[PDB]
Scaffold this active site. Structure first.
Site, short mmCIF file in Angstrom:
data_model
loop_
_atom_site.label_atom_id
_atom_site.label_comp_id
_atom_site.label_asym_id
_atom_site.label_seq_id
_atom_site.Cartn_x
_atom_site.Cartn_y
_atom_site.Cartn_z
N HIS A 129 0.84 -1.22 0.00
CA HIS A 129 0.00 0.00 0.00
C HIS A 129 0.88 1.28 0.00
N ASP A 178 9.75 22.35 -24.97
CA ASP A 178 9.64 21.04 -24.38
C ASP A 178 10.66 21.09 -23.19
N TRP A 231 7.35 -0.33 4.52
CA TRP A 231 7.98 0.28 3.34
C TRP A 231 9.39 0.77 3.66
N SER A 254 14.39 6.40 -12.40
CA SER A 254 13.43 7.23 -13.13
C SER A 254 13.39 8.65 -12.54
N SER A 255 13.33 8.72 -11.20
CA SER A 255 13.17 10.06 -10.58
C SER A 255 14.49 10.85 -10.60
N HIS A 265 13.15 11.31 5.05
CA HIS A 265 12.54 12.67 5.43
C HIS A 265 12.50 13.59 4.21
N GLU A 267 12.12 12.67 1.23
CA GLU A 267 11.01 12.13 0.42
C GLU A 267 9.68 12.72 0.83
N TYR A 302 9.03 15.65 1.93
CA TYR A 302 8.94 17.00 1.37
C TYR A 302 8.83 16.99 -0.14
N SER A 359 -0.75 26.94 -4.31
CA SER A 359 -0.60 28.42 -4.52
C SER A 359 -1.28 28.80 -5.84
N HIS A 411 14.58 12.09 13.62
CA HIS A 411 13.30 12.04 14.29
C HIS A 411 12.47 10.82 14.00
N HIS A 412 12.99 9.96 13.04
CA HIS A 412 12.30 8.65 12.85
C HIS A 412 12.99 7.55 13.67
N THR A 427 6.82 26.82 7.04
CA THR A 427 5.57 26.29 6.57
C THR A 427 4.43 27.25 7.06
N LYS A 452 3.81 29.89 4.54
CA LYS A 452 3.01 29.55 3.40
C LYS A 452 1.50 29.47 3.77
N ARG A 464 1.57 0.25 15.46
CA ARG A 464 1.52 0.06 13.99
C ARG A 464 1.82 -1.38 13.57
C1 HEA Z 1 3.63 14.61 2.96
C2 HEA Z 1 4.03 13.93 3.97
C3 HEA Z 1 4.60 14.45 5.21
C4 HEA Z 1 4.88 15.71 5.57
C5 HEA Z 1 4.86 17.00 4.70
C6 HEA Z 1 5.37 15.62 6.88
C7 HEA Z 1 5.63 16.79 7.61
C8 HEA Z 1 6.12 16.74 8.94
N1 HEA Z 1 6.29 15.65 9.77
FE1 HEA Z 1 5.95 13.70 9.20
N2 HEA Z 1 5.71 11.80 8.60
C9 HEA Z 1 5.23 11.37 7.37
C10 HEA Z 1 4.80 12.23 6.30
C11 HEA Z 1 4.91 13.63 6.31
N3 HEA Z 1 5.28 14.35 7.43
C12 HEA Z 1 5.30 9.95 7.25
C13 HEA Z 1 4.91 9.10 6.04
C14 HEA Z 1 5.75 9.46 8.45
C15 HEA Z 1 5.89 8.07 8.91
C16 HEA Z 1 7.15 7.44 8.28
C17 HEA Z 1 7.07 5.92 8.67
O1 HEA Z 1 7.55 5.58 9.79
O2 HEA Z 1 6.51 5.11 7.86
C18 HEA Z 1 5.98 10.64 9.32
C19 HEA Z 1 6.64 10.59 10.57
C20 HEA Z 1 7.04 11.75 11.31
C21 HEA Z 1 7.82 11.68 12.47
C22 HEA Z 1 8.33 10.38 13.14
C23 HEA Z 1 7.25 9.93 14.19
C24 HEA Z 1 7.56 8.55 14.66
O3 HEA Z 1 7.70 7.62 13.77
O4 HEA Z 1 7.54 8.30 15.90
C25 HEA Z 1 7.99 13.02 12.89
C26 HEA Z 1 8.82 13.38 14.01
O5 HEA Z 1 9.17 14.53 14.22
C27 HEA Z 1 7.31 13.81 11.92
C28 HEA Z 1 7.28 15.22 12.03
C29 HEA Z 1 6.81 16.02 11.00
C30 HEA Z 1 6.85 17.50 11.01
C31 HEA Z 1 7.29 18.37 12.20
C32 HEA Z 1 6.47 17.91 9.73
C33 HEA Z 1 6.43 19.42 9.37
O6 HEA Z 1 6.90 19.50 8.03
C34 HEA Z 1 4.94 19.94 9.43
C35 HEA Z 1 5.06 21.55 9.43
C36 HEA Z 1 3.59 22.07 9.33
C37 HEA Z 1 3.02 22.78 10.34
C38 HEA Z 1 3.54 23.00 11.72
C39 HEA Z 1 1.59 23.26 10.05
C40 HEA Z 1 1.44 24.68 9.36
C41 HEA Z 1 2.06 25.71 10.24
C42 HEA Z 1 1.36 26.80 10.85
C43 HEA Z 1 -0.09 27.08 10.68
C44 HEA Z 1 2.25 27.70 11.63
C45 HEA Z 1 2.13 27.78 13.13
C46 HEA Z 1 2.62 26.45 13.80
C47 HEA Z 1 3.30 26.27 14.88
C48 HEA Z 1 3.82 27.50 15.74
C49 HEA Z 1 3.62 24.93 15.42
N4 HEA Z 1 6.76 13.08 10.92
C1 HEA Z 2 0.49 8.88 -0.48
C2 HEA Z 2 0.47 8.03 0.65
C3 HEA Z 2 -0.69 7.40 1.25
C4 HEA Z 2 -2.02 7.54 1.07
C5 HEA Z 2 -2.75 8.48 0.07
C6 HEA Z 2 -2.68 6.65 1.90
C7 HEA Z 2 -4.07 6.44 1.93
C8 HEA Z 2 -4.74 5.53 2.79
N1 HEA Z 2 -4.08 4.76 3.70
FE1 HEA Z 2 -2.15 4.61 4.10
N2 HEA Z 2 -0.19 4.43 4.48
C9 HEA Z 2 0.82 5.04 3.83
C10 HEA Z 2 0.73 5.96 2.79
C11 HEA Z 2 -0.58 6.40 2.28
N3 HEA Z 2 -1.76 5.94 2.67
C12 HEA Z 2 2.14 4.73 4.33
C13 HEA Z 2 3.48 5.36 3.92
C14 HEA Z 2 1.85 3.80 5.32
C15 HEA Z 2 2.87 3.13 6.30
C16 HEA Z 2 3.33 1.71 5.66
C17 HEA Z 2 4.22 0.98 6.66
O1 HEA Z 2 3.81 0.89 7.86
O2 HEA Z 2 5.24 0.43 6.25
C18 HEA Z 2 0.44 3.64 5.38
C19 HEA Z 2 -0.17 2.88 6.36
C20 HEA Z 2 -1.60 2.80 6.51
C21 HEA Z 2 -2.27 2.18 7.57
C22 HEA Z 2 -1.56 1.64 8.85
C23 HEA Z 2 -1.28 0.08 8.61
C24 HEA Z 2 -0.64 -0.47 9.93
O3 HEA Z 2 0.15 0.20 10.63
O4 HEA Z 2 -0.90 -1.70 10.18
C25 HEA Z 2 -3.58 2.40 7.34
C26 HEA Z 2 -4.60 1.92 8.27
O5 HEA Z 2 -5.81 2.18 8.16
C27 HEA Z 2 -3.73 3.02 6.10
C28 HEA Z 2 -5.01 3.28 5.50
C29 HEA Z 2 -5.11 4.14 4.36
C30 HEA Z 2 -6.41 4.46 3.76
C31 HEA Z 2 -7.72 3.81 4.32
C32 HEA Z 2 -6.16 5.37 2.85
C33 HEA Z 2 -7.19 6.04 1.99
O6 HEA Z 2 -7.29 7.44 2.41
C34 HEA Z 2 -7.01 5.89 0.49
C35 HEA Z 2 -8.33 6.48 -0.26
C36 HEA Z 2 -7.96 6.68 -1.70
C37 HEA Z 2 -7.36 7.61 -2.22
C38 HEA Z 2 -6.65 8.67 -1.47
C39 HEA Z 2 -7.29 7.66 -3.81
C40 HEA Z 2 -6.07 7.39 -4.24
C41 HEA Z 2 -5.80 8.06 -5.61
C42 HEA Z 2 -6.11 8.18 -6.68
C43 HEA Z 2 -7.18 7.14 -7.06
C44 HEA Z 2 -5.50 8.81 -7.95
C45 HEA Z 2 -6.59 9.57 -8.76
C46 HEA Z 2 -5.86 9.89 -10.06
C47 HEA Z 2 -5.91 11.16 -10.65
C48 HEA Z 2 -6.69 12.37 -10.11
C49 HEA Z 2 -4.89 11.48 -11.78
N4 HEA Z 2 -2.54 3.33 5.58
O1 LIG Z 3 8.95 12.41 7.58
O2 LIG Z 3 8.10 13.40 8.42
CU LIG Z 4 10.68 12.84 8.79
#
Ligand code: HEA
Ligand code: HEA
Ligand SMILES: [O-][O-]
Ligand SMILES: [Cu+2]
Ligand SMILES: CCCCC/C=C\C/C=C/C/C=C\C/C=C\CCCC(=O)O[C@H](COC(=O)CCCCCCCCCCCCCCCCC)COP(=O)(O)OCCN
Ligand SMILES: CCCCCC/C=C\CCCCCCCCCC(=O)O[C@H](COC(=O)CCCCCCCCCCCCCCC)COP(=O)(O)OC[C@@H](O)CO
Ligand SMILES: CCCCCCCCCCO[C@@H]1O[C@H](CO)[C@@H](O[C@H]2O[C@H](CO)[C@@H](O)[C@H](O)[C@H]2O)[C@H](O)[C@H]1O
Ligand code: CUA
Ligand SMILES: [Mg+2]
Ligand code: NA
Ligand SMILES: [Zn+2]
Lengths: 49, 98, 227, 73, 259, 105, 58, 46, 144, 514, 84, 43, 79
Positions: J61, J91, J126, J156-157, J240, J242, J244, J255, J290-291, J316, J319, J438
């Site tokens: 998934h 292009d 993953w 590819s990327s 991490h 990735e 972003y 935007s 932090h992971h 952030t 923005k 998890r």
């Molecule tokens: C698009 C995906 C995405 C994005 C953008 C981010 C953004 C951020 N993530 Fe996340 N993160 C994930 C996807 C993402 N994360 C995934 C997939 C995992 C699990 C990986 C795995 O184990 O599988 C994870 C795990 C994860 C961890 C590890 C947790 C753990 O496994 O125990 C942490 C720890 O610090 C973290 C922190 C953050 C923070 C601080 C941001 C910051 O970038 C967010 C900044 C945004 C804001 C704060 C909101 C807007 C701000 C305001 C309105 C301003 C005012 C705010 C304040 C004064 C606070 N993330």
């Molecule tokens: C982009 C990343 C992404 C997205 C969108 C989602 C979407 C969803 N995920 Fe997630 N999920 C992960 C990334 C994502 N997940 C990751 C990184 C993990 C951790 C894996 C790990 O532990 O190793 C995870 C783990 C995870 C778990 C925890 C499993 C566990 O710890 O045992 C769960 C549990 O409910 C879950 C549920 C869902 C569900 C119900 C949705 C739903 O919201 C999905 C609904 C459908 C959509 C969002 C549509 C999708 C898109 C399109 C159809 C494209 C359309 C095309 C055009 C417009 C061109 N996901």
């Molecule tokens: O990776 O937050």
């Molecule tokens: Cu991170």
């Protein structure tokens, strides 16, 4: 010239709302799902030992 | 120490590369490598926009340092104005195949 | 343990877990206040037919929108790091216990005086005694003395696992070749449950941890009878 | 008839914005006091009142007499 | 007719054949590691080679024979090659981080020391030092070949470029002989792991860089480069300096500081 | 920047230019409605007289509807501004959108 | 060696509508068919190998 | 050259809406069904 | 009148309250009576009829601001259809319950939960706030 | 002609269309795997089998959603269609290499589905940590097929990052500085520098995993002096950055959509927006551990990674406040794309804030490896990256195809998906705070009410994905061809008509200096 | 550093050929003398079956599975010691 | 945006057919697998 | 002399979560001490502190494996 919303908007809103409530109440209450609510105020504790 | 045997671009460039190299020597810019410099842009002194066809897109950066560029098609005929700052542009069509 | 419909943390069993609870209340109010303020502005920006669509000057307002968030992050970070250092502080434990993770159960070693060790496996659902908790009870609990500083050392003899007890604020990964240390001190007697917290294969969901905290004299007699 | 008076005609968006950003600020201080009392303080007072006269041996003897432990009968 | 200076490329089959060669190489390595067979792998290596040959052939046809590399196209290809080399620097950063992690904190299983108990490093003052003089010398001779080509001197360009390639092949033969002579192997714990994977991917890059220099040697023999237009030689030289600088980091870190 | 009066004076100037052309009339109105204000009656009067010099009755009506739109939920502003312009409306024979039935949705 | 690039410039600029990868002559088509056949052939074989490997061989 | 314009700059035909429904059903429906058939395949092994 | 795809690079007409005077008239071609109306607009407007004035408005523009700004009933169709399809989802969950899921574990039987709840009170699960803090151990009943 | 156009392309718009079709198919694979996770968890007990089949579905998934749906749609699909048009370029810089970035993805996805077909799959997470993913606990071909699937998606990327950076630096009009390029083009440029520097360190880590599994190296095996925690530092040095890379193109499409449907010629604070995306890209390389707050790092390390990760909230927030200032004063058009963007501003803020909670390591000891982390990342991925992809798809679908969607159906689709995703993930915060781990195929009975609600939400999200497929069929079936688009003076990608001709900007724009 | 060298007017082909023949190829001939002078087999250390060396977690995909790719019988023992 | 009327209008009945076929395409094959889980599990 | 041993005390040499080197060092110290004492015709009782501390801290399989490899002559630390 009334559009689709003018002509069918009230019926889609009233029908969809009616339908959605009836089928989620039925699903929530009639088919044996176990929601596992809090025992607090609900469950009379029973000797287990 | 030294000696010859490597061709020059004058001798051996071809195709578009040679067209660009020969136009540059003439001070000409048929392939749009340089930014054109603006005129005062009044109706008496419009910016003159060369084209090979009857319309070309203009981007106007109305003031220095603006980050927004205003884009529109400029058509053959009477000068048109940028819709943001009003500065004038006039299309000058044609030919490029010398 | 967790109870049905629970919304927040398990109640604290150790002073560090209580600290984490009040630090999370502090952080959650801030989280609540900023997501509310954003939702509210969104609503405010969307509910007028008045318009102003010419270029807007950004510099003044960007001072507010960088300095007020910087000040909030300082207000989070200061109590956050005070807790981080308080947990790390030197404390003079009275006892060391080791736990080794395995696929799929935990073993425990208490070797400060005599060679005491045993395995602890989940009770299968078909064998639970009336009233016992599905997926959480084990056959041999980790009996420990209440109100005493204990050093737990955690490792693995196979793949990664992680040894967690949420109500004591504990989660330490179990890595082969590494001996990680944590401190445990329960303020109360009782039974405190946790579950393996790093994916470890077919029965990751089914290798729980049960600590049984009792007075020292009972722990000493239990330890003697387990030799 | 009477003529109509001249209303304010300038800065109506900015005036609305200022009034409600202030309003949100007053509301945010209101929720922070409320939450300090309903949640944070509530929790500190629940833990302090629990522990103030807590007797851990008493609590252990109750659990032991209820049969819960493997190490104490 | 366009009026910008960029190159609209003719529709080409080589991206698809290069992608399919990647599927055949990787599904080929999996059949070799798990199903005892090299058949898919050598099909993929063969089609990868055929793709590389016809794609780069067509870039020479587009530029030396058809004139499409105007200065703006050549500036793009400069940025492309610089960014490509930065990605390869970060691929080797991963293997340096593995080596420092393992050697700065040697675990009990190694004896708690580095080099581990039982490992007898090569002497960095013998063939490793000779390899470092060879690749430094080759950076001097390929600089002579670059300035000869800019000054229009065909004989000396070819003389210097041939000396550069000779030294690349000398390094690769020396490294192959030290692989065979070495008393430790890739299975000799993390010392052998770090040493053979990091020097092994560097040896692969020396063989890729030397092949790229041999392409430029034959193109220069065919008069393709002018004294001002020769980006394939500039790219091969930048790639060759990258292979030299990676070797200097490998020699300081793994052969000398890690002995 | 400048005072209110200075801002109003420059926009009355812009629209009073005797030989204003159609593009400048549209550029002026479409730029002026970007600002956070409903334009003063004196600005509107000069824009409606520019419409009369450009023989464009319809754009004069549209500028009266833009005034009402800019006032948003402040329903007191448009009737005020129409009051102030009643002598220019009568002098130039400009009917308001309500008199033409163009306020009907 | 003598400089024969102008002969190859004339060949690859002939106005014959050929894309560049086939513009050298009958060689290029033979090398293209070789490469494409190995790719497509080898891909079908990889799919056969996945079928074989997706079931136990007891 | 190639066809240009709406419905022509795509690798599938939209000339007939019911043949398009079939093709879109086959396309999206095969991606959504594949994990269920994979699961079935893993369950039927052991 | 009629806008054609091949007009995409020309100035176009738009009704939008923020751009009140668009780049072109809504109607550019004029019939004989329309031509005479545009000649009559060169004289005093007080001599135009209300109808003639409306006609000049509708040659220059398509919708008035009241028309382009009008509300609609589309929210009823959106909310109603979204409740419909959320209701359809519960059908899918009723089908899954009936055909997919088997019995849940025996630990959710009433007697098992009653005994499990007594044992959780005996081990004082969450005794400060969460769970046993809600039981009155003096009265032997849930706190009211 | 069909093989020449679609298999041998060198055109950025047709290669973008191929990426959007591939990403949409991968989204249906990813949605089915998400429904299998929530069917397993939607009542207590065991539905499919033990944790190995379950975590093969969780691992696939994630890889399908991240590498085959979000990256191909944002970077390959919207980046290829929009970036050359928004800079007037004819292009991409390497139009033929661009086609190989696309055609490496079907083989990468084939390798991923083969990994699940063979042996018992790769049930590793993953993140693919050893030793579970090594050759003793995951013997046989599944984990090597996953490695090679990530090697192909990585090449590819990386090739695609080289192409975007070169095209955005080198192919603007000569008068256009990079401070006159639109924000979506900046977001793709910064995402491509993050891909160029991060994917090679993942490729080094997973090649070390491949050689410990097949060549008897011991990078991560303590018996040879290796360390499983070194794999976690190499993977998260990429992982991490990735996340972003997954959200920055989304911030660039938000935007454009908020500017357009607020009727503004520009976003509020353009140079602040550029500063905040480059600050987030830079800070995103110095926070990876932090992971790893429960692996046993030193305290001062854990204080640094808590502080440096919190710092990201500053740019952030700029923005988010700048998108609110762009709506301020607008003539707001309540289009379906604007609905997705306003959902994104709020729900991404909620997810980013729970990310700040997790950045506090003391609290993350109790939240790591629980569902509070799964609620954080699905608010920023299912309610952030995916709401920016749906906003950008309904906003630009009439540019790519020349036909309009039905807006009422699209609003119905947004309302169903907004209820479903929130139903699915909001209750997972309670499961996390109360300790559910998890990667579990079953849970203690106390966790049953919120797991039942979250699986009911996942079925409502499935009804929205099915309805989105019908909406795209109804637009191609009805053929309502576009006529006039508003605001083309500040949205150059529409100025060539809908769809634009195969070759655009064959005569470049005219932009003077002045 | 300026190094000990001197030249600079322009850095041209003549100077880089002077550097290649007057510094870089003499350094390679000196290092070749130095190496091809400390060559000749130094004698192999007693075999000790240490468990962090000669790792075998999976047979190699060539040969008998137990020999490394550029196995040298004189110096590379197998897990069971040196070859016969 | 503005647009022409549909070149090939899809009436309410035609929409219900396309919606029903699209929903069936996702639900029938997964339903068949899930209905038959037990058959696969104990087999 | 310094009994009433309860467990191994804090050691400023090893102040972090990773305590692998603590166990190792003390096992080495014990065995080094013991070899010195068995040689020069002395008493292993003087090595006791190290023995207690390693036995407290070290997993039983690590000590078991290290003892096997000392017997086998493959223990890689210096004793
Ligand atoms: C698009 C995906 C995405 C994005 C953008 C981010 C953004 C951020 N993530 Fe996340 N993160 C994930 C996807 C993402 N994360 C995934 C997939 C995992 C699990 C990986 C795995 O184990 O599988 C994870 C795990 C994860 C961890 C590890 C947790 C753990 O496994 O125990 C942490 C720890 O610090 C973290 C922190 C953050 C923070 C601080 C941001 C910051 O970038 C967010 C900044 C945004 C804001 C704060 C909101 C807007 C701000 C305001 C309105 C301003 C005012 C705010 C304040 C004064 C606070 N993330
Ligand atoms: C982009 C990343 C992404 C997205 C969108 C989602 C979407 C969803 N995920 Fe997630 N999920 C992960 C990334 C994502 N997940 C990751 C990184 C993990 C951790 C894996 C790990 O532990 O190793 C995870 C783990 C995870 C778990 C925890 C499993 C566990 O710890 O045992 C769960 C549990 O409910 C879950 C549920 C869902 C569900 C119900 C949705 C739903 O919201 C999905 C609904 C459908 C959509 C969002 C549509 C999708 C898109 C399109 C159809 C494209 C359309 C095309 C055009 C417009 C061109 N996901
Ligand atoms: O990776 O937050
Ligand atoms: Cu991170
Ligand atoms: C002389 C210098 C040149 C090196 C080339 C020589 C031969 C093989 C080529 C490999 C090149 C690079 C690295 C691959 C990994 C390992 C090989 C390391 C170098 C080498 O050749 O190591 C040899 C082992 O080879 C073995 O196992 C070899 C097993 C061969 C199979 C290799 C497996 C393929 C790997 C996949 C790489 C994936 C790449 C990913 C790119 C990322 C995308 C962005 C060392 O011999 P030994 O007998 O153990 O010890 C000497 C004792 N006398
Ligand atoms: C065991 C070995 C097998 C494994 C795989 C690789 C093997 C060997 C490959 C060696 C690379 C050969 C590259 C040949 C490129 C020839 C085409 C070329 O050089 O083309 C030039 C453009 O540069 C261009 O595209 C620049 C192009 C190229 C980058 C090449 C660099 C390496 C790519 C390597 C793949 C790396 C693998 C990394 C593994 C982790 C043409 O422009 P000019 O020169 O200005 O000419 C025009 C003048 O004539 C006008 O007057
Ligand atoms: C997570 C995505 C999935 C959500 C749920 C899908 C809702 C399922 C839609 C229905 O699927 C059909 O269900 C029938 C049962 O209603 C199954 O018939 C089965 O049962 C019938 C009734 O017992 C027999 O007549 C049939 O032969 C037997 O195949 C049939 O195979 C299956 O295609
Ligand atoms: Cu042990 Cu998970
Ligand atoms: Mg973990
Ligand atoms: Na389950
Ligand atoms: Zn301008």
């Amino acid at each position: 010239a009334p559009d689709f919303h003018d002509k069918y908007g009230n019926a889609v809103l009233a029908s969809g709302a009616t339908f959605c409530v009836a089928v989620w109440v039925y699903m929530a209450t009639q088919i044996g799902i176990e929601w596992n609510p809090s025992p607090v105020g609900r469950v009379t504790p029973k000797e287990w030992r | 120490a030294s000696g010859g045997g490597v061709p020059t671009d004058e001798e051996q460039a071809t195709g578009l590369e040679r067209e660009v190299m020969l136009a540059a020597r003439k001070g000409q810019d048929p392939y749009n490598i340089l930014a054109p410099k603006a005129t005062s842009g009044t109706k008496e002194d419009p910016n003159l926009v060369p084209s090979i066809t009857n319309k070309r897109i203009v981007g106007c950066i109305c003031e220095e340092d603006n980050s927004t560029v205003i884009w529109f098609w400029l058509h053959k005929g009477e000068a048109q104005r940028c819709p943001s700052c009003g500065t004038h542009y006039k299309l000058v069509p044609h030919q490029l195949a010398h | 343990m967790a109870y049905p419909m629970q919304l927040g943390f398990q109640d604290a069993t150790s002073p560090i877990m209580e600290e984490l609870l009040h630090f999370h209340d502090h952080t959650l109010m801030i989280v609540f206040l900023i997501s509310s303020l954003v939702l509210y502005i969104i609503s405010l920006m969307l509910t007028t037919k008045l318009t102003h669509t010419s270029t807007m000057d950004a510099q003044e307002v960007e001072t507010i929108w960088t300095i007020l968030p910087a000040i909030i992050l300082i207000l989070i970070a200061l109590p956050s790091l005070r807790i981080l250092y308080m947990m790390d502080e030197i404390n003079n434990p009275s006892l060391t216990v080791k736990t080794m993770g395995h696929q799929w159960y935990w073993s425990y070693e208490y070797t400060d005086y005599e060679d005491l060790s045993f395995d602890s496996y989940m009770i299968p659902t078909s064998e639970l005694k009336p009233g016992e908790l599905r997926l959480l009870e084990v056959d041999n609990r980790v009996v420990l003395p209440m109100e005493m500083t204990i050093r737990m050392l955690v490792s693995s003899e196979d793949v990664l696992h992680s040894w967690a007890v949420p109500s004591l604020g504990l989660k330490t990964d179990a890595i082969p070749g590494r001996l990680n240390q944590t401190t445990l001190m329960s303020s109360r007697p009782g039974l405190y449950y946790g579950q393996c917290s790093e994916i470890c294969g077919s029965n990751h969901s089914f290798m729980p941890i049960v600590l049984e905290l009792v007075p020292l004299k009972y722990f000493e007699k239990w330890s003697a009878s387990m030799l | 008839s009477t003529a109509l008076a001249k209303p304010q005609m300038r800065g109506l968006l900015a005036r609305r914005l200022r009034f409600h950003i202030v309003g949100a600020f007053m509301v945010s201080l209101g929720f922070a006091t409320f939450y300090k009392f309903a949640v944070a303080e509530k929790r500190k007072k629940a833990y302090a009142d629990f522990y103030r006269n807590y007797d851990s041996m008493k609590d252990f003897e109750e659990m032991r007499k209820a049969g819960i432990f493997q190490s104490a009968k | 007719h366009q009026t910008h200076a960029y190159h609209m490329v003719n529709p080409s089959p080589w991206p698809l054949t290069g992608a399919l060669s990647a599927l055949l190489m990787t599904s080929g390595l999996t059949m070799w590691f798990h199903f005892n067979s090299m058949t898919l792998l050598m099909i993929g290596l063969t089609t990868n080679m055929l793709t590389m040959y016809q794609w780069w052939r067509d870039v020479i046809r587009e530029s030396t024979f058809q004139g499409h590399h105007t200065p703006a196209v050549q500036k793009g290809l400069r940025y492309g090659m610089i960014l490509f080399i930065i990605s390869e620097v970060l691929f080797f950063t991963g293997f340096f981080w593995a080596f420092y992690h393992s050697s700065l904190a040697p675990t009990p299983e190694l004896g708690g020391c580095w080099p581990p108990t039982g490992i007898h490093p090569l002497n960095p003052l013998e063939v490793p030092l000779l390899n470092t003089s060879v690749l430094l010398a080759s950076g001097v001779s390929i600089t002579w070949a670059h300035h000869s080509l800019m000054e229009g001197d065909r004989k000396h360009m070819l003389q210097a470029l041939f000396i550069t390639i000779t030294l690349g092949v000398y390094f690769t033969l020396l490294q192959a002989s030290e692989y065979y002579e070495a008393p430790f192997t890739i299975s000799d714990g993390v010392y052998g792991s770090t040493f053979f994977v990091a020097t092994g991917f560097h040896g692969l890059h020396v063989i890729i860089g030397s092949t790229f220099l041999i392409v430029c040697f034959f193109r220069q023999l065919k008069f393709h480069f002018t004294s001002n237009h020769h980006f394939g030689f500039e790219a091969a030289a930048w790639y060759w300096h990258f292979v030299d600088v990676v070797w200097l980091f490998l020699y300081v870190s793994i052969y000398w500081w890690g002995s | 920047h400048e005072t209110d009066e200075e801002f109003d004076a420059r926009w009355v100037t812009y629209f009073n230019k005797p030989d204003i052309d159609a593009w400048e009339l549209r550029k002026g109105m479409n730029t002026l409605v970007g600002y956070d204000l409903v334009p003063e009656p004196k600005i509107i009067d000069a824009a409606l007289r520019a419409c009369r010099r450009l023989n464009d009755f319809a754009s004069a009506v549209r500028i009266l509807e833009v005034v009402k739109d800019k006032a948003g939920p402040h329903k007191e502003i448009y009737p005020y501004v129409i009051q102030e312009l009643r002598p220019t409306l009568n002098e130039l024979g400009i009917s308001t959108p309500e008199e033409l039935g163009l306020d009907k949705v | 060696f003598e400089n024969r690039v102008a002969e190859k410039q004339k060949l690859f600029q002939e106005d014959n509508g050929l894309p560049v990868h086939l513009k050298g002559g009958a060689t290029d088509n033979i090398l293209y068919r070789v490469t494409m056949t190995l790719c497509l052939g080898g891909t079908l074989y990889s799919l056969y190998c996945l079928g074989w490997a997706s079931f136990p061989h007891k | 050259h190639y066809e240009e314009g709406p419905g022509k700059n795509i690798p599938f035909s939209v000339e007939n809406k019911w043949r398009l429904l079939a093709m879109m059903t086959l396309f999206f429906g095969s991606g959504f069904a594949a994990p269920f058939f994979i699961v079935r395949h893993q369950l039927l092994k052991k | 009148s009629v806008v054609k795809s091949e007009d995409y690079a020309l100035p176009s007409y738009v009704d939008r309250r923020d751009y009140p005077l668009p780049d072109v008239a809504h109607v550019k071609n004029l019939s004989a009576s329309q031509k005479a109306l545009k000649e009559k607009e060169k004289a005093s407007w007080s001599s135009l009829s209300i109808d003639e004035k409306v006609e000049l408005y509708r040659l220059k523009f398509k919708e008035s601001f009241a028309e382009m700004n009008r509300s609609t009933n589309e929210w009823k169709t959106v909310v109603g259809a979204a409740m419909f399809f959320i209701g359809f989802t519960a059908l899918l969950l009723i089908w899954e319950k009936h055909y997919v899921y088997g019995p849940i574990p025996h630990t959710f039987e009433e007697e098992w939960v009653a005994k499990q709840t007594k044992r959780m009170l005996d081990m004082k699960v969450a005794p400060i706030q969460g769970f046993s803090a809600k039981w009155d151990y003096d009265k032997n009943e849930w706190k009211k | 002609m069909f093989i020449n156009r679609w298999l041998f392309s060198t055109n950025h718009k047709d290669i973008g269309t191929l990426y959007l079709l591939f990403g949409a198919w991968a989204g249906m694979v990813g949605t089915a795997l998400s429904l299998l996770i929530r069917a397993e968890l939607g009542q207590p007990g065991t539905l499919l089998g033990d944790d190995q089949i379950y975590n093969v579905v969780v691992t696939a998934h994630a890889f399908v959603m991240i590498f085959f749906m979000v990256m191909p749609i944002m970077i390959g699909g919207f980046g290829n269609w929009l970036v050359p048009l928004m800079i007037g370029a004819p292009d991409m810089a390497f139009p033929r290499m661009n086609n190989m970035s696309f055609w490496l993805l079907p083989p990468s996805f084939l390798l991923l589905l083969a990994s699940s077909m063979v042996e018992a799959g790769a049930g590793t997470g993953w993140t693919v940590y050893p030793p579970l993913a090594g050759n003793l606990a995951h013997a046989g071909a599944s984990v090597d097929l996953t490695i090679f699937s990530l090697h192909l998606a990585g090449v590819s990327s990386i090739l695609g990052a080289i192409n975007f950076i070169t095209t955005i630096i080198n192919m603007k009009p000569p008068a256009m500085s990079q401070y006159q390029t639109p924000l979506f083009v900046w977001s793709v440029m910064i995402t491509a520098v993050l891909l160029l520097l991060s994917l090679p360190v993942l490729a080094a880590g997973i090649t070390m995993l491949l050689t410990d599994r097949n060549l008897n190296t011991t990078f991560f095996d303590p018996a040879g002096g290796g360390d499983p925690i070194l794999y976690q530092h190499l993977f998260w040095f990429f992982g991490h950055p990735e996340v972003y890379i997954l959200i920055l193109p989304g911030f660039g499409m938000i935007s454009h959509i908020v500017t357009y449907y607020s009727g503004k010629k520009e976003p509020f604070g353009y140079m602040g927006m550029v500063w905040a995306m480059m600050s987030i890209g830079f800070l995103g390389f110095i926070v990876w551990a932090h992971h790893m707050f429960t692996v046993g790092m030193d305290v001062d390390t854990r204080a640094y990674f808590t502080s440096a990760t919190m710092i990201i909230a500053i740019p952030t927030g700029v923005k988010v406040f700048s998108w609110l200032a762009t709506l301020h004063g607008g003539n707001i058009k309540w289009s379906p794309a604007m609905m997705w963007a306003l959902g994104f501003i709020f729900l991404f803020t909620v997810g980013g804030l729970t990310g700040i909670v997790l950045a506090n390591s003391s609290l993350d000891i109790v939240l790591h490896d629980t569902y509070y982390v799964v609620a954080h990342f699905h608010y920023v991925l299912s309610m952030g990256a995916v709401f920016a992809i749906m906003g950008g798809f309904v906003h630009w679908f009439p540019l790519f195809s020349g036909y309009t969607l039905n807006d009422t159906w699209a609003k119905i689709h947004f309302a169903i998906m907004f209820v479903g995703v929130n139903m699915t993930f909001f209750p997972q915060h309670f499961l996390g705070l109360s300790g559910m781990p998890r990667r579990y195929s079953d849970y203690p009975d106390a966790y049953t009410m919120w797991n039942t609600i979250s699986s009911m939400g996942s079925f409502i999200s499935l009804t929205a994905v099915m309805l989105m497929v019908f909406i795209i069929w109804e637009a191609f079936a009805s053929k309502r061809e576009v006529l006039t688009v508003d605001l083309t003076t500040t949205n150059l990608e529409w100025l060539n008509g809908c769809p634009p001709p195969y070759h655009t900007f064959e005569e470049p724009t005219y932009v003077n200096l002045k | 550093a300026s190094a000990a060298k001197g030249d600079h007017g322009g850095t041209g082909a003549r100077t880089w050929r002077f550097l290649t023949f007057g510094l870089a190829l003499p350094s390679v001939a000196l290092c070749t003398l130095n190496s091809w002078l400390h060559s000749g087999h130094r004698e192999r250390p007693a075999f000790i079956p240490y468990h962090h060396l000669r790792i075998r977690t999976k047979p190699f995909s060539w040969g008998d599975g137990n020999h490394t790719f550029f196995h040298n019988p004189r110096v590379n023992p197998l897990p069971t010691g040196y070859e016969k | 945006i503005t647009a022409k009327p549909a070149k090939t209008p899809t009436s309410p009945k035609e929409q219900a057919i396309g919606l029903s076929v699209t929903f069936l395409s996702f639900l029938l094959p997964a339903g068949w697998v899930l209905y038959h889980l037990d058959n696969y599990k104990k087999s | 002399k310094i009994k009433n041993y309860q467990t191994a005390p804090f050691d400023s040499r090893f102040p972090n979560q990773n305590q692998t080197r603590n166990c190792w060092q003390n096992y080495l110290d014990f065995h080094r001490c013991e070899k010195a004492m068995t040689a020069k015709g002395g008493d292993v009782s003087v090595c006791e502190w190290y023995r207690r501390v390693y036995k407290s801290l070290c997993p039983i399989s690590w000590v078991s494996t290290w003892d096997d490899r000392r017997a086998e002559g493959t223990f890689p630390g210096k004793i």
